[PDB]
CSV table of C-alpha atoms and ligand atoms in Angstrom, one decimal:
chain,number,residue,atom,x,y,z
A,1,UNK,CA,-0.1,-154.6,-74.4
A,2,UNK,CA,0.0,-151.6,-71.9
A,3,UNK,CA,2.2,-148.5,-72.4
A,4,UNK,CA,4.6,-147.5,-70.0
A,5,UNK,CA,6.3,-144.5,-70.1
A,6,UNK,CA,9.8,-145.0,-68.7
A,7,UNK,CA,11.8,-142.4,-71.0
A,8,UNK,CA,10.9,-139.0,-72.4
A,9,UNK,CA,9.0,-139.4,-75.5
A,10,UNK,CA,9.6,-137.2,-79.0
A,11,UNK,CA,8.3,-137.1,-82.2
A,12,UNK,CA,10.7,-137.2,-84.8
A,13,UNK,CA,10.5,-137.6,-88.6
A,14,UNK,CA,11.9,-138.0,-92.2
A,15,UNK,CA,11.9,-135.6,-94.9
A,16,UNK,CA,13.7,-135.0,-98.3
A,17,UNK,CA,13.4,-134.8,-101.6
A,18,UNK,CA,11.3,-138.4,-103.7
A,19,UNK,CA,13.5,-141.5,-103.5
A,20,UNK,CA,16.6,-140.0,-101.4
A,21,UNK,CA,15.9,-142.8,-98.5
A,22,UNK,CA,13.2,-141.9,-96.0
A,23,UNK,CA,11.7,-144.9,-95.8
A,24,UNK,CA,14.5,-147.1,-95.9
A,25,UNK,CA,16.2,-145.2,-93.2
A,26,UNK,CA,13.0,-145.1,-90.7
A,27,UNK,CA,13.1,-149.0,-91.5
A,28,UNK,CA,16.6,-149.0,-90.3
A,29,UNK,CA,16.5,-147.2,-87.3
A,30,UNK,CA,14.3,-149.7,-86.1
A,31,UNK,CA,16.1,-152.8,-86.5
A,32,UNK,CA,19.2,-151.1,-85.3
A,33,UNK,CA,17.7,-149.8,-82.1
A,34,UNK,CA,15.9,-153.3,-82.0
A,35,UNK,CA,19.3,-154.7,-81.2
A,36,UNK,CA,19.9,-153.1,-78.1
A,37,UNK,CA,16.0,-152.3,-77.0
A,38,UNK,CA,14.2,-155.6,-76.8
A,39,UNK,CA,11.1,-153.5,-76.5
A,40,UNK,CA,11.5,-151.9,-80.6
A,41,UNK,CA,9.5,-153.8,-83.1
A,42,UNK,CA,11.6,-154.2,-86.2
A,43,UNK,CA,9.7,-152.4,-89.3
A,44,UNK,CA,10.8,-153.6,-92.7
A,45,UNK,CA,10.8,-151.7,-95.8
A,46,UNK,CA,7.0,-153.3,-97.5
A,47,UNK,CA,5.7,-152.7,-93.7
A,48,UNK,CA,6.3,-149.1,-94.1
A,49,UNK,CA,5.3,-148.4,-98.0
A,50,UNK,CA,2.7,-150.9,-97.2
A,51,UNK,CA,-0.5,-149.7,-98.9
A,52,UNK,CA,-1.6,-150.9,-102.4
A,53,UNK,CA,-1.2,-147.7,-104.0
A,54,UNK,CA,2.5,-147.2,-102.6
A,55,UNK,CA,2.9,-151.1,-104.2
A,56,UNK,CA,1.2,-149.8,-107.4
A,57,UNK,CA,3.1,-146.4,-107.7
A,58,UNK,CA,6.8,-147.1,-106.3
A,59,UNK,CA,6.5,-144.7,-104.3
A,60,UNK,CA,5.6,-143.4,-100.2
A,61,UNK,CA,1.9,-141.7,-100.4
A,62,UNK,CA,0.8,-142.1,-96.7
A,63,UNK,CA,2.9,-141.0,-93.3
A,64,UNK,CA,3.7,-143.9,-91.3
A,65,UNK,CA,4.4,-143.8,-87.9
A,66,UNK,CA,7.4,-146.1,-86.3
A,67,UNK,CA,8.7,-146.8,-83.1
A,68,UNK,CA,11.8,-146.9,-81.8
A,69,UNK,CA,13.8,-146.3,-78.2
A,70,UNK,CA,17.5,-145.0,-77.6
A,71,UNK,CA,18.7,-145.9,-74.1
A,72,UNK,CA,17.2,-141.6,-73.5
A,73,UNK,CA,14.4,-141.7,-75.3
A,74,UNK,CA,11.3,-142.7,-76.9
A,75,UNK,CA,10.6,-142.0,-80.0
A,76,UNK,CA,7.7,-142.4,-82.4
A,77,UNK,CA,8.6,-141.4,-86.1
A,78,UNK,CA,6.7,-140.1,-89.0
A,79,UNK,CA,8.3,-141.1,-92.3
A,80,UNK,CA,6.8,-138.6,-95.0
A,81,UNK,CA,6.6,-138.9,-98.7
A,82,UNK,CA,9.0,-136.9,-100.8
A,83,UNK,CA,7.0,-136.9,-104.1
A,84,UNK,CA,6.0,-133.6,-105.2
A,85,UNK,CA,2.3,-134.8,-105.5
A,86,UNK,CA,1.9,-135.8,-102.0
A,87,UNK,CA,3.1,-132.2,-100.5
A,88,UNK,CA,-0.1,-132.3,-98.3
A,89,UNK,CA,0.4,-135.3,-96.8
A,90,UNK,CA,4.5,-134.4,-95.8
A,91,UNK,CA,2.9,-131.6,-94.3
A,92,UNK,CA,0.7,-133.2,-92.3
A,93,UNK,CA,3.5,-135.6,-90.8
A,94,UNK,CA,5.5,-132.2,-90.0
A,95,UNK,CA,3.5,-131.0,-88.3
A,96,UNK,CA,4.1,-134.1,-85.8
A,97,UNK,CA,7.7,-133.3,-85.3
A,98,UNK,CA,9.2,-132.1,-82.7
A,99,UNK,CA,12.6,-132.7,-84.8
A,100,UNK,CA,13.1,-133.5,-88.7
A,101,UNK,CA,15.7,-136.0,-90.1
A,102,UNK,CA,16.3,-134.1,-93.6
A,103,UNK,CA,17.8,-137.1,-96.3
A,104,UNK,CA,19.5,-136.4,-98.7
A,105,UNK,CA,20.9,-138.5,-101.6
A,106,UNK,CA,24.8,-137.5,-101.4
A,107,UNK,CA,24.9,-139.0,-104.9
A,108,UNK,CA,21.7,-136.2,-106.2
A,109,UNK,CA,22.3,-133.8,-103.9
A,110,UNK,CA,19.7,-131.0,-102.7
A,111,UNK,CA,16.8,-131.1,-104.8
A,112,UNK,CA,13.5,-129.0,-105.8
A,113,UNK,CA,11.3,-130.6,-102.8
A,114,UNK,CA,14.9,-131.0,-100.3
A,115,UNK,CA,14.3,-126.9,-100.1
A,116,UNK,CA,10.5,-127.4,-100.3
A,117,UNK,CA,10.4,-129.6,-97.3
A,118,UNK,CA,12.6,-127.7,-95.5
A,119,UNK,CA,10.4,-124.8,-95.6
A,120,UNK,CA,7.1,-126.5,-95.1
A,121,UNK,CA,8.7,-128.0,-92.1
A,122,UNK,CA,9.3,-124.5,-90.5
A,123,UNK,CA,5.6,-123.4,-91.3
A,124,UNK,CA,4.3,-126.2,-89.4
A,125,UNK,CA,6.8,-125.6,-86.6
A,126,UNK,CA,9.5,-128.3,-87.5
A,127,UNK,CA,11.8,-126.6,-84.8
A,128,UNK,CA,15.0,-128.3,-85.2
A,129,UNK,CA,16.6,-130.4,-88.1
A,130,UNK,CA,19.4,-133.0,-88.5
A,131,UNK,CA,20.6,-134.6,-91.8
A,132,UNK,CA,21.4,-137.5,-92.8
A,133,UNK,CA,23.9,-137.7,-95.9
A,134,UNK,CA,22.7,-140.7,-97.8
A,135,UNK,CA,23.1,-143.4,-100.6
A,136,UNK,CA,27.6,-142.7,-99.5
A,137,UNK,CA,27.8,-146.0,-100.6
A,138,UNK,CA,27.2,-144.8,-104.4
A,139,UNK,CA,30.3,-142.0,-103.8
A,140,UNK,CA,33.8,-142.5,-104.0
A,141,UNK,CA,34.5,-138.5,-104.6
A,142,UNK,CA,35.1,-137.1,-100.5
A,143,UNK,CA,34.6,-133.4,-102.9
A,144,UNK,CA,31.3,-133.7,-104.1
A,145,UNK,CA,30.0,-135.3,-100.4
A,146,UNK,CA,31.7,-132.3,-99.3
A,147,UNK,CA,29.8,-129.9,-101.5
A,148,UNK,CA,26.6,-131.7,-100.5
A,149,UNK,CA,27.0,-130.9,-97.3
A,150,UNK,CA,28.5,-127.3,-98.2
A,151,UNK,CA,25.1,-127.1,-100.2
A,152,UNK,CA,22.4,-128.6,-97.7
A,153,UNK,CA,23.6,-126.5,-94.5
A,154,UNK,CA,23.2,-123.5,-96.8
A,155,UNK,CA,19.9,-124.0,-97.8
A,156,UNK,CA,18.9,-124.7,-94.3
A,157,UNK,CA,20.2,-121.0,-93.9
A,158,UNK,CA,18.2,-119.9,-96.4
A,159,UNK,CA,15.2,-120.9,-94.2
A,160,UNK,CA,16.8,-119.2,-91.3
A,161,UNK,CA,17.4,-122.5,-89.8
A,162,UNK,CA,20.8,-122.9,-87.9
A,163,UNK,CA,22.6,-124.6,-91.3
A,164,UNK,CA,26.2,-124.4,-90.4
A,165,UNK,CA,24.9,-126.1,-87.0
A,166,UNK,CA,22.9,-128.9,-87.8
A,167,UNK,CA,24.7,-132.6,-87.5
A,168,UNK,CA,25.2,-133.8,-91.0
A,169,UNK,CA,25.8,-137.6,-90.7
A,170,UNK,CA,27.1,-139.7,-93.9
A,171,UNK,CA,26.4,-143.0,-94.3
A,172,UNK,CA,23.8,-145.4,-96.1
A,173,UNK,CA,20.6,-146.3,-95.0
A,174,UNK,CA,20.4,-149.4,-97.3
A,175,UNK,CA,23.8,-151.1,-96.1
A,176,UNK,CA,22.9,-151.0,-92.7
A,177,UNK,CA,19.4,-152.4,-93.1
A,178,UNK,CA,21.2,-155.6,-95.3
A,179,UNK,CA,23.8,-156.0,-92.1
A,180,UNK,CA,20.5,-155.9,-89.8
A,181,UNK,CA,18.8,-158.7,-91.9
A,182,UNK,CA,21.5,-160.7,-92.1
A,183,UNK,CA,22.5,-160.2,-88.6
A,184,UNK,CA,19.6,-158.3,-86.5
A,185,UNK,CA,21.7,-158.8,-83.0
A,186,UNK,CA,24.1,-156.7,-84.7
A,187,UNK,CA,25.0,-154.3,-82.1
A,188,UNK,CA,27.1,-150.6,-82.6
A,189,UNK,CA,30.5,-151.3,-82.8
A,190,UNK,CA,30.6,-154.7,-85.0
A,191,UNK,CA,30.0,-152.8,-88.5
A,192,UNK,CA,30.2,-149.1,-90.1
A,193,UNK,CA,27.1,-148.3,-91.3
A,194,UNK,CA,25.2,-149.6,-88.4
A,195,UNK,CA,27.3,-147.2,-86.6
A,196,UNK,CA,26.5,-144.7,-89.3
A,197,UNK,CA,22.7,-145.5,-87.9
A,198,UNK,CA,24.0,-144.8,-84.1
A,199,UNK,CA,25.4,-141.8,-85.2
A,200,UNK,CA,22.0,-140.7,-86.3
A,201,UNK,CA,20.4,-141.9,-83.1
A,202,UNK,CA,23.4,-140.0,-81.1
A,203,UNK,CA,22.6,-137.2,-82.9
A,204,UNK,CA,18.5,-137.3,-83.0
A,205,UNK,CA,19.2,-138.0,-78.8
A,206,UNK,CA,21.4,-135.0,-78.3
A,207,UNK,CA,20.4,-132.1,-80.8
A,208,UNK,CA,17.1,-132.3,-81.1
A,209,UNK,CA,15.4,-131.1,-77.2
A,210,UNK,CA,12.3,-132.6,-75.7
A,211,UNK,CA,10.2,-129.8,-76.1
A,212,UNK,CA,8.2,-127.8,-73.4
A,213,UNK,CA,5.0,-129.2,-73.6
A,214,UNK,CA,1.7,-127.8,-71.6
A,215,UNK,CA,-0.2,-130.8,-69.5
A,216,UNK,CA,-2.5,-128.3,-67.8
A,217,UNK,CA,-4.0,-126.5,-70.8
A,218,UNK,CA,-7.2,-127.8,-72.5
A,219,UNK,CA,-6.8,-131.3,-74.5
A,220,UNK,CA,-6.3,-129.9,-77.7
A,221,UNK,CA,-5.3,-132.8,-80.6
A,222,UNK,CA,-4.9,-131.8,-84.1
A,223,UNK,CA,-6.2,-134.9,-86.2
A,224,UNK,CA,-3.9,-136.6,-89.0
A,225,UNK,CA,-5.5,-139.7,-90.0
A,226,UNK,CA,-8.9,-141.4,-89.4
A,227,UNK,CA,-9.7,-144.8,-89.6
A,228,UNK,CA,-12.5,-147.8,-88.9
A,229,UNK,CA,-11.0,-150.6,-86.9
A,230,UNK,CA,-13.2,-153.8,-87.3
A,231,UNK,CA,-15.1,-154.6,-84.6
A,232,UNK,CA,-13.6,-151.6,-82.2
A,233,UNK,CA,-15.0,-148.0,-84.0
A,234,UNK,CA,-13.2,-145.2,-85.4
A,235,UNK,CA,-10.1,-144.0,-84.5
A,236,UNK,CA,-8.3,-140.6,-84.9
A,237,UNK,CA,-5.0,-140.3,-84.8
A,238,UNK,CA,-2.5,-137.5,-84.1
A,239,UNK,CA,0.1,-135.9,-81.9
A,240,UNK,CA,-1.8,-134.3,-78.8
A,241,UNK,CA,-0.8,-130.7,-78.9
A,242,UNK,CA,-1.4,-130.0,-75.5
A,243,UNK,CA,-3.3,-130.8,-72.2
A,244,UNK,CA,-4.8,-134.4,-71.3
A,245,UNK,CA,-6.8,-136.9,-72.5
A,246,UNK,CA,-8.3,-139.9,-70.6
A,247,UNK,CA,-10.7,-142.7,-72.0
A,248,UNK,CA,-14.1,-141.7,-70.4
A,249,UNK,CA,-13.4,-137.6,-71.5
A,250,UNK,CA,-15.9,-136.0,-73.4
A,251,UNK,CA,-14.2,-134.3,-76.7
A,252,UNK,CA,-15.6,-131.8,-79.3
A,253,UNK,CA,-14.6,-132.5,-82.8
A,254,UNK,CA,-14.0,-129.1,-84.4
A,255,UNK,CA,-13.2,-127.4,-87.6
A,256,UNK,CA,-14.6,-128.3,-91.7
A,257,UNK,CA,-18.2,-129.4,-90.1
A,258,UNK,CA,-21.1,-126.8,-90.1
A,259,UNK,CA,-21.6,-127.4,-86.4
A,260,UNK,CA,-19.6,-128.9,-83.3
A,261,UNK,CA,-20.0,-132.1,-82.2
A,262,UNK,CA,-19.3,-133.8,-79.1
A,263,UNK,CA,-18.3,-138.0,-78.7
A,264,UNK,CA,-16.5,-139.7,-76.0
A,265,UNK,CA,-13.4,-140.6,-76.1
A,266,UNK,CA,-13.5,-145.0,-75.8
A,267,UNK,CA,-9.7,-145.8,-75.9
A,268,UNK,CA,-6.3,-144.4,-76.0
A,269,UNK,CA,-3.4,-145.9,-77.8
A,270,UNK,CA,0.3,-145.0,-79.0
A,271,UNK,CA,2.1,-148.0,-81.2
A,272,UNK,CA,-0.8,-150.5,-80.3
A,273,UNK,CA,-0.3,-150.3,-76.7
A,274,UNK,CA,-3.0,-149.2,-74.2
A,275,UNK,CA,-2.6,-145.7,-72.5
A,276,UNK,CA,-4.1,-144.7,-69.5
A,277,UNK,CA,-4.0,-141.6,-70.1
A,278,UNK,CA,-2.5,-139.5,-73.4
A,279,UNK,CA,-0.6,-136.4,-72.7
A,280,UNK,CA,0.8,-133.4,-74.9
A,281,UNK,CA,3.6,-135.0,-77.2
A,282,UNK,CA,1.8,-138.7,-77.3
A,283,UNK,CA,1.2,-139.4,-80.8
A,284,UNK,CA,-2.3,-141.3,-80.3
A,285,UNK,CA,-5.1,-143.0,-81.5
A,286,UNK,CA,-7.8,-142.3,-79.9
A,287,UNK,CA,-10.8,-144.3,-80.1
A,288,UNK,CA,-14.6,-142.1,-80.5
A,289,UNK,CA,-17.8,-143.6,-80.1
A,290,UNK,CA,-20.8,-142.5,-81.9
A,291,UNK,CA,-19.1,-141.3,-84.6
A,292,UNK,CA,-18.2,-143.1,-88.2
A,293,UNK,CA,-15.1,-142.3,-90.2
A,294,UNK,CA,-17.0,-140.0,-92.4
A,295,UNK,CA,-17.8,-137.5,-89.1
A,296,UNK,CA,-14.2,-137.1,-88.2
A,297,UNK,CA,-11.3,-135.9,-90.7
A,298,UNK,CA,-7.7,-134.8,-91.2
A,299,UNK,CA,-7.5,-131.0,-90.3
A,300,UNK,CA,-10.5,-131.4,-87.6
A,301,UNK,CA,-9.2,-130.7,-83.7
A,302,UNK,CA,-10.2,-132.8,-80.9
A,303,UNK,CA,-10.9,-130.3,-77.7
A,304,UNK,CA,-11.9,-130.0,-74.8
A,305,UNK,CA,-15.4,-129.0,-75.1
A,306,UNK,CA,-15.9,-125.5,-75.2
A,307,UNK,CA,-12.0,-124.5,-75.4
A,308,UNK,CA,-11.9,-124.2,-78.9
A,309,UNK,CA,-13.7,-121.9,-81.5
A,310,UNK,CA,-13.4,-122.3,-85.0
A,311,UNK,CA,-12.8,-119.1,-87.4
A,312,UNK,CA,-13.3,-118.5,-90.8
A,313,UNK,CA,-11.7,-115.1,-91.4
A,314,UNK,CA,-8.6,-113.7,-90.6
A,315,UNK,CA,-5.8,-111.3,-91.0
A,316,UNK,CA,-2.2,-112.1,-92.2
A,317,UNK,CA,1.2,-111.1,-92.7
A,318,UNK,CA,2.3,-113.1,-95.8
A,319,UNK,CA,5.6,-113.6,-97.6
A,320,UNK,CA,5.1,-114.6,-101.1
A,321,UNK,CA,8.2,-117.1,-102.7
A,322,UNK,CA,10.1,-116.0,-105.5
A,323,UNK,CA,10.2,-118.0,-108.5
A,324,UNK,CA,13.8,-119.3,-107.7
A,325,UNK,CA,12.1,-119.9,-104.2
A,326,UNK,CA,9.7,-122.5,-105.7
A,327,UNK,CA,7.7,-120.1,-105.8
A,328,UNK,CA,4.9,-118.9,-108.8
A,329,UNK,CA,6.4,-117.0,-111.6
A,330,UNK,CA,3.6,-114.3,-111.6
A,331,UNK,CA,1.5,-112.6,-109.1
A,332,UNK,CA,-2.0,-112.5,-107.6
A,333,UNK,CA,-5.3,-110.1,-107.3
A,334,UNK,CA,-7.8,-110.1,-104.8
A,335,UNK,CA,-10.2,-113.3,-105.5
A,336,UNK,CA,-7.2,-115.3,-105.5
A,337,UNK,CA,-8.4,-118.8,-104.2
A,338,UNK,CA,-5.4,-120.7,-102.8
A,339,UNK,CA,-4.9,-123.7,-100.3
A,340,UNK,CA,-4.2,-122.7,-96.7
A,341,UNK,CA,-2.5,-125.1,-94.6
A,342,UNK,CA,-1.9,-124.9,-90.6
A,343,UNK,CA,-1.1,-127.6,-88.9
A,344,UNK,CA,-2.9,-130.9,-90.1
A,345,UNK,CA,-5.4,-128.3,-91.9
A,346,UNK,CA,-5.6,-127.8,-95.6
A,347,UNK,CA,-8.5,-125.5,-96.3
A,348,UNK,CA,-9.1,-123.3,-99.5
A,349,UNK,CA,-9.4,-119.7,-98.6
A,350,UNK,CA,-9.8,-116.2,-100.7
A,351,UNK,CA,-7.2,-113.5,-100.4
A,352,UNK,CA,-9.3,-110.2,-99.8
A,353,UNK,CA,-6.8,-107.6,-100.7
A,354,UNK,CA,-6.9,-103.7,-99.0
A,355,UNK,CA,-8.5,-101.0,-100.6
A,356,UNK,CA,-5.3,-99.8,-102.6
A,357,UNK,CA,-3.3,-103.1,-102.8
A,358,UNK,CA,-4.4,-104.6,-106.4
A,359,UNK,CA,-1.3,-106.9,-106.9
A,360,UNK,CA,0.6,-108.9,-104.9
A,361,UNK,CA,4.2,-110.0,-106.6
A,362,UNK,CA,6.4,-112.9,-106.1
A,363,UNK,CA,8.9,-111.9,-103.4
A,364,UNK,CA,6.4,-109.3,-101.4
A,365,UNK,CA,5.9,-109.1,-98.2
A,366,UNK,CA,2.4,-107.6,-97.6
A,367,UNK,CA,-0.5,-108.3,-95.2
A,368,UNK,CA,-4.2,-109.4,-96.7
A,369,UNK,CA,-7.2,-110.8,-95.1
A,370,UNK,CA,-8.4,-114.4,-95.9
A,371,UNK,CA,-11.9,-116.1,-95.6
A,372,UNK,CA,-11.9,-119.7,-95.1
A,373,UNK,CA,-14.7,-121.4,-97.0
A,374,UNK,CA,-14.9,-124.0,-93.8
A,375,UNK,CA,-14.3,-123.0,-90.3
A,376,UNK,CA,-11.3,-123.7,-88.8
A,377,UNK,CA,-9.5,-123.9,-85.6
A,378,UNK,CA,-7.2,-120.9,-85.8
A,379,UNK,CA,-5.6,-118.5,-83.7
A,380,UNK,CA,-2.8,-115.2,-83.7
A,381,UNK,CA,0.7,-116.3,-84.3
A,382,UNK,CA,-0.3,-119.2,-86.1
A,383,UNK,CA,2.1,-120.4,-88.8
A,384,UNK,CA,1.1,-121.3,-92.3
A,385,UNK,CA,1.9,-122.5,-95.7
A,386,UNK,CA,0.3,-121.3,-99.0
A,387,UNK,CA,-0.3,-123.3,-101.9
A,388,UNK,CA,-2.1,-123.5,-104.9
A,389,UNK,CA,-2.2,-125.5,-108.1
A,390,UNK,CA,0.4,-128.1,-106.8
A,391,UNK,CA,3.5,-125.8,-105.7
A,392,UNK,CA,4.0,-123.7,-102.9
A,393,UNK,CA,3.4,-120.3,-103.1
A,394,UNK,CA,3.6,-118.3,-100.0
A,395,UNK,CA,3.9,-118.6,-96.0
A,396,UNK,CA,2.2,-116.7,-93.7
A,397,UNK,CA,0.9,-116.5,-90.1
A,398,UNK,CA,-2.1,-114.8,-88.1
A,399,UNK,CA,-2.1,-111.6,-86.9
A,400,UNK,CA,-5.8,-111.0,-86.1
A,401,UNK,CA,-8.7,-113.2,-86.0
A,402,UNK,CA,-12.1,-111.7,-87.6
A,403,UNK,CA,-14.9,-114.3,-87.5
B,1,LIG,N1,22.7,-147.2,-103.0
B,1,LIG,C1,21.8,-146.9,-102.1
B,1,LIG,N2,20.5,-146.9,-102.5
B,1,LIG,C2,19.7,-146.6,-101.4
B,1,LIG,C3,20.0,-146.3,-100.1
B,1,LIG,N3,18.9,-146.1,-99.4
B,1,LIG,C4,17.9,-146.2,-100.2
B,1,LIG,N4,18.3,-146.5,-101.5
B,1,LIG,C5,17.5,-146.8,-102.7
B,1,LIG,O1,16.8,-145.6,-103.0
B,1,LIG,C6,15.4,-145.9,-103.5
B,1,LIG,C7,14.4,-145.1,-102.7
B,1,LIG,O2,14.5,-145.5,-101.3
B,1,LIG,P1,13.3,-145.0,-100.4
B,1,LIG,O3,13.6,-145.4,-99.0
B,1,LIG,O4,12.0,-145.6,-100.9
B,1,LIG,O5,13.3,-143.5,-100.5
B,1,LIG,P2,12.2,-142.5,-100.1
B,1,LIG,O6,12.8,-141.2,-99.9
B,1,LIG,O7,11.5,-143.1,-98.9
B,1,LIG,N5,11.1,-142.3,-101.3
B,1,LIG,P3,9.7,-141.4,-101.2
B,1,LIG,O8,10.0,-140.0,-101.5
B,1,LIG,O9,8.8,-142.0,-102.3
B,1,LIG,O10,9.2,-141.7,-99.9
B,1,LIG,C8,15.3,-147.4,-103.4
B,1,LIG,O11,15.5,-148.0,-104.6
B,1,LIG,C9,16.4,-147.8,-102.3
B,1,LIG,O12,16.8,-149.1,-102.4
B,1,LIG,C10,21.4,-146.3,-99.8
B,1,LIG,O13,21.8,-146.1,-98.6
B,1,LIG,N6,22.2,-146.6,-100.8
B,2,LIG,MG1,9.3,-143.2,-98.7
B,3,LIG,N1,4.1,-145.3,-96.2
């Protein structure tokens, strides 16, 4: 039907390390909010991991987007994968959230892509993080829950996010979705680990702000996803970053293509429901005609036309992880051809050491130029991630844009 903004609207998500419970707690925080919001679709485990591959594999490849409402807020979600092969695509949902929900399995504890997620999250601009303890169920020890928690809120520190602050709720994401099925009027109060689920919700209402966001700035829209609906046209889908967009609005697609281009924007949507207009923090699809699914990609930017141009060289300050960071074991000369990430973006790019600088080691801070083999949109004080055969690398941001 028609969206209709009644509540402040944030974009939160799940991250953690592969098979600690994303997915099947961002399938029940919809049926427990469905209980007391008529308006919340319930979303069931196979509607979330829904695509053939995720069948064939076991596993969550694609973000999904969810729905949900507190009596606050709305909320749309962006349940990541945790598998160490999909890195680029839990990027890409980061870079949605206004707020993270970090799992993690109190029976596994912090794992290898627990600290890599944590850290992507910051380089995309995750700005605050709440965690949800999970799998309890499987723990009779309160010691080793307590030295989870001990372990998790430390390395949050580590990433110079506020660890010994952030709310640390225990309870089981797979208990509370059975209570649902088997009663889905359940409301808070009637059983523990849906309450364990409002907890969650409390805490996702209360901790994490609703973020200053710019209406009056161009539309600026980093792209996710893109997709051909039958019989409608393509759609691009992503979290408008600032400014406006209205069906009718010219918008340049920018970034990875040789050359510009301009469509018009023919529809506007957030969880299949019409918008009038989209507005910085909607998480969208928008609709563009004239253009095929094979003219528009992840990492492009929808702009206002004429707002935005994309740069292909730039300067950088760069922290490169130590090994025991995730890091690479050895270092890197000039020529180096890693992936670059900002934003939605994941570009290759070549590290042009200074005259002088030969090496750059695991744990150095140092500044380098890099040259972007497609253009992208960029700009100073822009966050970013490094990565290069499958691990993580280095994080960076702008300091000075070149060409
Ligand atoms: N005992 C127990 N098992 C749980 C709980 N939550 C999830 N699981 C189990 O843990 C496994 C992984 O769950 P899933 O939600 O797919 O995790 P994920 O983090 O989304 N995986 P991925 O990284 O691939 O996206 C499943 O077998 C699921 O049933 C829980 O609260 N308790
Ligand atoms: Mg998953
Ligand atoms: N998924």
């Amino acid at each position: 039907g028609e969206f209709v903004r009644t509540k402040p609207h944030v974009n939160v998500g799940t991250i953690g390390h592969v098979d600690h419970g994303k997915t099947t707690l961002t399938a029940a925080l919809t049926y427990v909010a469905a209980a007391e919001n008529p308006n919340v679709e319930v979303k069931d485990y196979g509607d979330i991991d829904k695509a053939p591959e995720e069948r064939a594999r076991g596993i969550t490849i694609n973000t999904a987007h969810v729905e949900y409402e507190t009596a606050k807020r709305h909320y749309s979600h962006v349940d990541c994968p945790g598998h160490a092969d999909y890195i680029k695509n839990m990027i890409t949902g980061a870079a949605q959230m206004d707020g993270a929900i970090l799992v993690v399995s109190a029976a596994d504890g912090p794992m290898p892509q627990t600290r890599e997620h944590i850290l992507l999250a910051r380089q995309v601009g995750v700005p605050y993080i709440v965690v949800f303890m999970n799998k309890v169920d499987m723990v009779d020890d309160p010691e080793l829950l307590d030295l989870v928690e001990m372990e998790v809120r430390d390395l949050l520190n580590q990433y110079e996010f506020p660890g010994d602050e952030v709310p640390v709720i225990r309870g089981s994401a797979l208990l509370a979705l059975e209570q649902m099925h088997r009663n889905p009027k359940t409301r808070r109060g009637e059983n523990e680990w849906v309450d364990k689920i409002w907890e969650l919700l409390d805490a996702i209402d209360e901790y994490i702000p609703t973020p200053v966001r710019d209406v009056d700035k161009p539309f600026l829209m980093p792209v996710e996803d893109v997709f051909t609906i039958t019989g409608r046209g393509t759609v691009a889908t992503g979290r408008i970053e600032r400014g406006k967009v209205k069906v009718g609005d010219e918008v340049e697609i920018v970034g990875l293509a040789p050359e510009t281009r301009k469509t018009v924007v023919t529809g506007v949507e957030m969880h299949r429901k019409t918008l009038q207009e989209g507005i910085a923090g909607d998480n969208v699809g928008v609709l563009l005609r004239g253009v095929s699914r094979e003219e528009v990609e992840r990492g492009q930017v929808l702009a206002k036309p004429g707002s935005i141009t994309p740069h292909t060289k730039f300067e950088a300050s760069v922290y490169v992880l130590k090994k025991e960071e995730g890091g690479r074991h050895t270092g890197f000369f000039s020529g180096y051809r890693p992936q670059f990430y900002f934003r939605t973006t994941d570009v290759t790019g070549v590290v042009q050491l200074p005259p002088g600088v030969e090496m750059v080691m695991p744990g150095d801070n140092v500044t380098f130029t890099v040259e972007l083999i497609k253009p992208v949109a960029l700009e100073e004080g822009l966050r970013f991630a490094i990565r290069e055969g499958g691990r993580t690398v280095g994080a960076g941001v702008v300091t000075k844009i070149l060409e």
